[PDB]
Scaffold this active site. Structure first.
Site, PDB file in Angstrom:
ATOM      1  CG  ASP B  61      -1.262   0.184  -2.930  1.00  0.00           C
ATOM      2  OD1 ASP B  61      -1.352   0.764  -4.037  1.00  0.00           O
ATOM      3  OD2 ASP B  61      -1.687  -0.978  -2.742  1.00  0.00           O
ATOM      4  CG  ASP B  62       1.903   3.178  -7.118  1.00  0.00           C
ATOM      5  OD1 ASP B  62       3.154   3.315  -7.103  1.00  0.00           O
ATOM      6  OD2 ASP B  62       1.242   3.218  -8.167  1.00  0.00           O
ATOM      7  CE  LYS B 137      -2.859  -3.643  -4.665  1.00  0.00           C
ATOM      8  NZ  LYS B 137      -3.672  -2.528  -4.075  1.00  0.00           N
ATOM      9  CG  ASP B 139      -1.327  -2.451  -9.490  1.00  0.00           C
ATOM     10  OD1 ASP B 139      -2.071  -3.083 -10.265  1.00  0.00           O
ATOM     11  OD2 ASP B 139      -1.709  -1.371  -8.926  1.00  0.00           O
ATOM     12  CB  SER B 171      -3.068  -6.674  -9.530  1.00  0.00           C
ATOM     13  OG  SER B 171      -2.910  -6.169  -8.216  1.00  0.00           O
ATOM     14  NE  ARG B 196      -8.622  -5.372  -6.458  1.00  0.00           N
ATOM     15  CZ  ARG B 196      -8.126  -4.230  -6.927  1.00  0.00           C
ATOM     16  NH1 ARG B 196      -7.044  -3.687  -6.371  1.00  0.00           N
ATOM     17  NH2 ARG B 196      -8.716  -3.634  -7.961  1.00  0.00           N
ATOM     18  CG  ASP B 200      -8.200   0.088  -8.714  1.00  0.00           C
ATOM     19  OD1 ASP B 200      -7.891  -1.094  -9.012  1.00  0.00           O
ATOM     20  OD2 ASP B 200      -7.394   1.036  -8.795  1.00  0.00           O
TER      21      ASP B 200
HETATM   22  C1  LIG Z   1      -2.968  -0.843  -8.755  1.00  0.00           C
HETATM   23  O1  LIG Z   1      -3.089   0.589  -8.897  1.00  0.00           O
HETATM   24  C2  LIG Z   1      -3.091   1.360  -7.665  1.00  0.00           C
HETATM   25  C3  LIG Z   1      -1.726   1.973  -7.368  1.00  0.00           C
HETATM   26  O2  LIG Z   1      -1.363   2.935  -8.364  1.00  0.00           O
HETATM   27  C4  LIG Z   1      -3.575   0.533  -6.467  1.00  0.00           C
HETATM   28  O3  LIG Z   1      -2.557  -0.354  -5.972  1.00  0.00           O
HETATM   29  C5  LIG Z   1      -4.715  -0.353  -6.907  1.00  0.00           C
HETATM   30  O4  LIG Z   1      -5.244  -1.030  -5.760  1.00  0.00           O
HETATM   31  C6  LIG Z   1      -4.201  -1.351  -7.950  1.00  0.00           C
HETATM   32  F1  LIG Z   1      -5.246  -1.645  -8.696  1.00  0.00           F
HETATM   33  F2  LIG Z   1      -3.825  -2.450  -7.330  1.00  0.00           F
END
Ligand SMILES: *[C@@H]1O[C@H](CO)[C@H](O)[C@H](O)C1(F)F
Ligand SMILES: *[C@@H]1O[C@H](CO)[C@@H](O[C@@H]2O[C@H](CO)[C@@H](O[C@@H]3O[C@H](CO[C@H]4O[C@H](CO)[C@@H](O)[C@H](O)[C@@H]4O)[C@@H](O)[C@H](O[C@H]4O[C@H](CO)[C@@H](O)[C@H](O)[C@@H]4O)[C@@H]3O)[C@H](O)[C@H]2NC(C)=O)[C@H](O)[C@H]1NC(C)=O
Ligand SMILES: *[C@@H]1O[C@H](CO)[C@@H](O[C@@H]2O[C@H](CO)[C@@H](O[C@@H]3O[C@H](CO[C@H]4O[C@H](CO)[C@@H](O)[C@H](O)[C@@H]4O)[C@@H](O)[C@H](O[C@H]4O[C@H](CO)[C@@H](O)[C@H](O)[C@@H]4O)[C@@H]3O)[C@H](O)[C@H]2NC(C)=O)[C@H](O)[C@H]1NC(C)=O
Ligand SMILES: *[C@@H]1O[C@H](CO[C@@H]2O[C@@H](C)[C@@H](O)[C@@H](O)[C@@H]2O)[C@@H](O[C@@H]2O[C@H](CO)[C@@H](O)[C@H](O)[C@H]2NC(C)=O)[C@H](O)[C@H]1NC(C)=O
Ligand SMILES: *[C@@H]1O[C@H](CO)[C@@H](O[C@@H]2O[C@H](CO)[C@@H](O)[C@H](O)[C@H]2NC(C)=O)[C@H](O)[C@H]1NC(C)=O
Ligand SMILES: *[C@@H]1O[C@H](CO)[C@@H](O)[C@H](O)[C@H]1NC(C)=O
Ligand SMILES: *[C@@H]1O[C@H](CO)[C@@H](O)[C@H](O)[C@H]1NC(C)=O
Ligand SMILES: *[C@@H]1O[C@H](CO)[C@H](O)[C@H](O)C1(F)F
Lengths: 387, 387
Positions: B61-62, B137, B139, B171, B196, B200
Site C-alpha cells: 500500500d502507501d 490499487k 488511490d 478508489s 472502494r 477507510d
Molecule cells: C488511500 O489512503 C491510504 C494510504 O495513504 C490507504 O491506501 C487507504 O486504503 C486509501 F483510502 F485507499
C-alpha cells in the site's frame, strides 16, 4: 453513606447486563432469572477464586418479583424462586458471599414489575432486612422528579431504621441528567453508598467510550465527591461478554480501576474464558481499585495523537497511571516523562506494568520513556518512589 | 473490467490497515513498511494454509515510494526496499502468490509520497508491468474531480496496453461520495475490477457498522453493479487485529462474504491466533464468497428486535443466509421460517451452519426454526434444495 459499608468500591457480580429480563425458564432454564442461576454463580464465585480476590456481592437485578401478598409484602416469582429469597440469602451467606437485591422508586420497575412507591418504601426496606439482604439497588423508572426527591432519602432512612447494614445503590442522578443544579452530589454522598451517574452500559465499545467521555467531561464535578462509603458508578464491567475485544476488556478494567469505580461483573461465570478471568482477577489491579484512600482518578493529559493519560493517587505515595489509546489503527509508541505528567522532582520512581508484570526502574522526572499502546487499549503502571 | 481477471472477488493480504505508514525501520524493524515485512508475510501465506485456501494477493500500500529517477521512473525507498520491486515480485511469484502495488492518481499519495499525475500514468503502468506486478490499487488524494475523470480510464487503458493482466482496484468513487450522480457505476464496471465505494475501514466495530449501514442504505444502487470482474469494495478485513471481538470478527467475515466483497486481510500473519485463522480459512465461507455467479447479496429483512437477515443467491439454487444481531444485550432466540423469508414453496431444503458445521435437514417453507444469535454476532447458513 455513613453506614460502615463499602470503604472501598464494591466488588461482585450483578445479573442485569448479561442476563437482563429473561424469564422464560421453560425454554431457557440455564439462563433465565431464577434461584438456580444465582446459586450456580455463587458456586462459581466460591470455587473459581472470585471470592478470594474480593468479589463478594452477588446481586439480583430486575424481574425477580412475583407480586405482593395479602399484607402488601413483596414476594419473588414462586415458579422461578421456589425456595424463597431467605433461602437464597442463607445459601449465599454460607459460601462467604453477600446478597444484593433490586427495587424501583416509582409505580413500576423499568420492566413493569411491582414498583416501590412512597407508601411502600418502609415496608420493602423491612422485608429486605428480614430476608438478610446485604445490598439494594433502587432504580428510578415510572416516577416524577418530586417522588424521587422524596423517595431516595426515604429509603436511605428506612434501611437505616431496620438496624441491618445494607449497601445502598442509587439510580436517582441518572434520571435527572447527572449534573448540577438538578443533581445534588453532596446529598447523594450522604444518603447512598454509590450512585449510577449516567446511561446504562451496553455490550459495546461505543457504550464504554460514551460513559468514559461523560465522566471525563464532568470530572471537575464528579471526581471530588467520590470516596470511602460513597462512590460514583459508571455501571457494570463487560469483561467476559460479547462486545469487547481483548484490548478493550483490559481497557475497561484499567479505566474503571483508576476511576475508583465498583468492580461489578455481569457475565456467565460458568463459561468465562481463562483470559477474561485473568483480567478480572489481576491482584495488582484489584489492590489499586481497593486502595484505602479511595481517591478517584482523573484524566490528566490528552494529545492530538489520541493518547490519553489517566492518573489516580494511591496510599504510601504510590500512583496508578493509565496510558490509553483512542486510536483505531495500530500500536502507538507514546513518548513521555514523569516530569511532563507533573510528578514530584528529585525523587527516583519505579513502575510495575499491571498487565505484563514488568518492572521499569530508574525513572526520574526528566527520564524519557516509551510505552507501546494498542488501538483501543491501555498500558497501566503502578508507580512508586524507590529512592 | 473485461481483462479476464477477478471472476471471483480477490483474496489476499493488504499492508495498510494493520501496518499503515510506519517507516521507522531503525526502531521498529519487524513492523515497518519494508521488503522484509512483505517477504515474511509471503512466507506465512505459503506455509500456513493461506495460499491453499485461495488467499493469493500480497499487496503493498502507501509509503513504499522512494522518488523518481533521472528518467522520471518510480523507485521504491532504497533503504526499506534495497533489492527493488522486481526482486519482491519474483520472490512472491516463486511461492505461488501475486504481488499488488499502490499508486495515487494525483500530485502525491495520501501520505505525501510521489503521485502518479496524468503525465505519469502511462510510464507508471509500464513500470508496474515491467516489474511484473499483478494488481494495482490507485488511490485518489491530491487530485481534482476532472483529473480523476481522465486519470482512471487512462490508467485502465495504459495497463491494458502493457499486455500484462493487472487487476485494477479504483478508489475513485470514495473521493466522489460514492453515489450517483457523481459516481457512474456503469463506467466503473467497464474500467475497474473493483472499487472502494466508501470510507477507510478502521480497527473498530463502529467502523464496520458504519460501512455496513452505508452499503445497506444504498444496496438498490450498489448490489446490481457487482459481478465477475467488477466488485464493490467495502475495504479490508479486520480479523486478527485489535478492535473486533470474536463475535464481531465472525460477523465481518460472514457479511463481507454475503456482500461478495474482496477478502483482503490486513493483519500480522506471524502472530495470528488459531481462532482468527479458523474464521478466515473457513472452507465453506470461502466457497460462498467465491461463488461463480458473483451475485452480491442484500439485507432482505430488519426487525425492531434489531435482528437483520442478509441473503445471497449462489450457484445450483443454493443460498447463503446471515442472521445478524445489532443487539448489545444478550443472545437472542430468533424465530422464523423459510416461507417468511420468501423462499420457493413446495421445496425441501437443507442448511449447513457455516461456523459450527451442523446440518439442519428437511426444512420446508412452513417449518419453524430457531437460531440463537449472540450480540454483535451472526449465525450463517448455507442453504440448498434436496430431493
Ligand atoms: C488511500 O489512503 C491510504 C494510504 O495513504 C490507504 O491506501 C487507504 O486504503 C486509501 F483510502 F485507499
Ligand atoms: C444509620 O445512620 C447512622 C448515621 O446517621 C449510622 O451510624 C454511624 O455508623 C457508622 C458505622 O457503624 C459509624 O462509623 C464508625 O465510627 C466509629 C467510631 O467513630 C466515633 O468517633 C469519631 C471521632 O473521629 C466520631 O466522628 C464518630 O461520631 C464516632 O463517635 C469508628 O471506629 C468506625 O471506624 C471503622 O472503620 C475504620 C476504617 O477507616 C477502621 O479503621 C476501624 O477499625 C473501624 O472498623 C466507623 O467509622 C458512625 O460513627 C455512625 N455515625 C453516627 C452519626 O452515629 C448507622 O450505622 C446507620 N444504621 C444503619 C443500620 O444503616
Ligand atoms: C485489454 O483489453 C481488451 C479489450 O477489452 C481485452 O480483451 C478482452 O479479453 C476478454 C477476457 O479474455 C475477452 O472475453 C472473453 O471472450 C471469449 C471469447 O470471445 C471471442 O469472441 C469475442 C466477440 O464476441 C471477441 O472479442 C474475442 O476476440 C473472441 O474471439 C469468451 O469465451 C470468454 O468467456 C468467459 O466468460 C464466460 C462468462 O460468460 C465464461 O462462461 C467462460 O468460462 C469464460 O471465462 C470471455 O468473455 C474479450 O473477448 C476480449 N475483448 C476483445 C475486444 O478482444 C484484453 O484482455 C485486455 N488485456 C489486458 C492485458 O488487460
Ligand atoms: C404513577 O402512578 C400514579 C398513581 O395512579 C396509578 O395509575 C392510575 C392510572 C390508576 O391505575 C391508579 O389506580 C394507580 O394508582 C399516577 O397518578 C395519577 O395521575 C393521574 C393523572 O395522570 C390522575 O388522574 C390520578 O388521580 C393519579 N392517581 C392517584 C389517585 O394518585 C401517576 O400518573 C404515575 N406517575 C407517572 C407520571 O408516570
Ligand atoms: C498539483 O500540482 C500542480 C503543479 O505544481 C499544482 O499547480 C500549482 O498550484 C500551486 C498551489 O496552488 C500554485 O502556486 C502554482 O501556480 C501551480 N503551478 C502550476 C505549474 O500549475 C496543483 O495545484 C496541484 N493540484 C492539486 C489538485 O493538488
Ligand atoms: C528527552 O527527550 C526530549 C524530547 O525529545 C528532549 O528534549 C530531552 O533532551 C530528553 N531528555 C533526556 C533526559 O534525555
Ligand atoms: C409455526 O409456529 C406458529 C406458532 O404461533 C404456528 O402458528 C405455525 O402454524 C407454525 N408453522 C407450522 C406450519 O409448523
Ligand atoms: C434500571 O433499569 C434496568 C432494569 O430494568 C437495570 O437495572 C439498569 O441497570 C437500571 F438502569 F439501573
Amino acid at each position: 453513606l455513613d453506614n460502615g459499608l463499602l470503604q472501598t468500591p464494591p466488588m461482585g457480580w450483578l445479573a442485569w447486563e448479561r442476563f437482563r429480563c429473561n424469564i422464560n425458564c421453560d425454554e431457557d432454564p440455564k439462563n433465565c432469572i431464577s434461584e438456580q442461576l444465582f446459586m450456580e454463580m455463587a458456586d462459581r464465585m466460591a470455587q473459581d477464586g472470585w471470592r478470594d480476590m474480593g468479589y463478594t456481592y452477588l446481586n439480583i437485578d430486575d424481574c425477580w418479583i412475583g407480586g405482593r401478598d395479602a399484607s402488601g409484602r413483596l414476594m419473588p416469582d414462586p415458579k422461578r424462586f421456589p425456595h424463597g429469597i431467605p433461602f437464597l440469602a442463607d445459601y449465599v451467606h454460607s459460601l462467604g458471599l453477600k446478597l444484593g437485591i433490586y427495587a424501583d422508586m416509582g409505580n413500576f420497575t423499568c420492566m413493569g414489575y411491582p414498583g416501590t412507591t412512597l407508601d411502600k418504601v418502609v415496608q420493602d426496606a423491612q422485608t429486605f432486612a428480614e430476608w438478610k439482604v446485604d445490598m439494594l439497588k433502587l432504580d428510578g423508572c415510572f416516577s416524577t422528579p418530586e417522588e424521587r426527591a422524596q423517595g431516595y432519602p426515604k429509603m436511605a432512612a428506612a434501611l437505616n431504621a431496620t438496624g441491618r447494614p445494607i449497601a445502598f445503590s442509587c439510580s436517582w442522578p441518572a434520571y435527572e441528567g447527572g449534573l448540577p443544579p438538578r443533581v445534588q452530589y453532596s446529598l447523594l454522598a450522604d444518603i447512598c453508598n454509590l450512585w449510577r451517574n449516567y446511561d446504562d452500559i451496553q455490550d459495546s465499545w461505543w457504550s464504554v467510550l460514551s460513559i468514559l467521555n461523560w465522566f471525563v467531561e464532568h470530572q471537575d464535578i464528579l471526581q471530588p465527591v467520590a470516596g470511602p462509603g460513597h462512590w460514583n458508578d459508571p455501571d457494570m464491567l463487560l469483561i467476559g461478554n460479547f462486545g469487547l475485544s481483548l484490548e478493550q476488556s483490559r481497557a475497561q478494567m484499567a479505566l474503571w480501576t483508576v476511576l475508583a469505580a465498583p468492580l461489578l461483573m455481569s457475565t456467565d461465570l460458568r463459561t468465562i474464558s481463562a483470559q477474561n478471568m485473568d483480567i478480572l482477577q489481576n491482584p495488582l489491579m484489584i489492590k489499586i481499585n481497593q486502595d484505602p484512600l479511595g481517591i478517584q482518578g482523573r484524566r490528566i493529559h490528552k494529545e492530538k495523537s489520541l493518547i490519553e493519560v489517566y492518573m489516580r493517587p494511591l496510599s504510601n505515595k504510590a500512583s496508578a497511571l493509565v496510558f490509553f489509546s483512542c486510536r483505531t489503527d495500530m500500536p502507538y509508541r507514546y513518548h513521555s516523562s514523569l516530569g511532563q505528567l507533573n510528578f514530584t522532582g528529585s525523587v527516583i520512581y519505579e513502575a510495575q506494568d499491571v498487565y505484563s508484570g514488568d518492572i521499569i526502574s530508574g525513572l526520574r522526572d526528566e527520564t524519557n520513556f516509551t510505552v507501546i499502546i494498542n488501538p483501543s487499549g491501555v498500558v497501566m503502571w503502578y508507580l512508586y518512589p524507590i529512592k
